[PDB]
Amino acid sequence: DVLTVSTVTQKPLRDSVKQALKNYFAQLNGQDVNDLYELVLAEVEQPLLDMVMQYTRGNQTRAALMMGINRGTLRKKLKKYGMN
Amino acid sequence: SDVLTVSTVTQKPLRDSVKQALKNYFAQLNGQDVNDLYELVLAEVEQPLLDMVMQYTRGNQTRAALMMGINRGTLRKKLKKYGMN
Amino acid sequence: MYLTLQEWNARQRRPRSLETVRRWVRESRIFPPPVKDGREYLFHESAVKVDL
Amino acid sequence: MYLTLQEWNARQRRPRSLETVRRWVRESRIFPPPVKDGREYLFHESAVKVD
DNA sequence: AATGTTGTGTTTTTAACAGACTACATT
DNA sequence: AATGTAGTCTGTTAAAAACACAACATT
Fold first, then answer.
1. Structural domain tally of chain C?
2. Four-way CATH pick for A1-84: 1.10.10.200, 1.10.10.10, 3.40.50.920, 1.10.10.60
3. What CA–CA distance (Å, rounded) separates B50 from A69?
């Protein structure tokens, strides 16, 4: 409910996800899909990390406290998406 | 390139669509304490993914799990979370 | 070389349900018999299906 | 009656690392929440570790 | 000199994981 | 009849969390 992308109206991010997948599922020509959770997750993690790090003016400690994840976890998540 | 795109008319990624909802959220937040955001974003992305994949596999939990690349137990647990038991 | 149940199954001409493949191991229907190394089984990359 | 982080920690059944204690404050794990009174924290004598 | 940060180790706890299985469904 | 699945279990382990500590910066 608190997360909305200015579509001009205020449609949730929940709806925005459903549409990208409807387009993906259509684009897929019956190919086997071994890992989708990660496809979606990596696409949502990379921007989330970039938004908070910007918001906390680079403070890893604060960024971690904000997201509700361990500092080690944030560090690991950043290193994944080459933000180390 | 990025297989996940929402028809904005152009094809802008979901990665961009996430950045915008958060920019709006951060602005909407009137200095209230934010103890857990990862989950806020995650639950908002999981609930639709599940509903979509489940629809695509015509209700098959087994297949849905294999597709997402998560353990069957995990999918079951994820569904029960968002009251899709 | 050894493989996981998942890996082996996915290589087979007709990959079957993981639960079906497990039931088979339990039934001594995979040769050489895959072994439980901790949390999971290990199949010979060229392991075969047999009649019960 | 108020105490320093050092004082409070040293009174606890299992005194922990000062870095860990200052971390608990930051993570809202100490009740009543200690506040920086100027340059440093004031834990009230009644302060206790919370979930 | 107390407190905060980053970088890097450990130890402890949580959660995803593979599998066991039975009744029923699909083939 | 052979194989596939929902549901309800078990135990194993990779991952997250929590705690360390040594730098050095900020207060």
1. 1
2. 1.10.10.60
3. 23
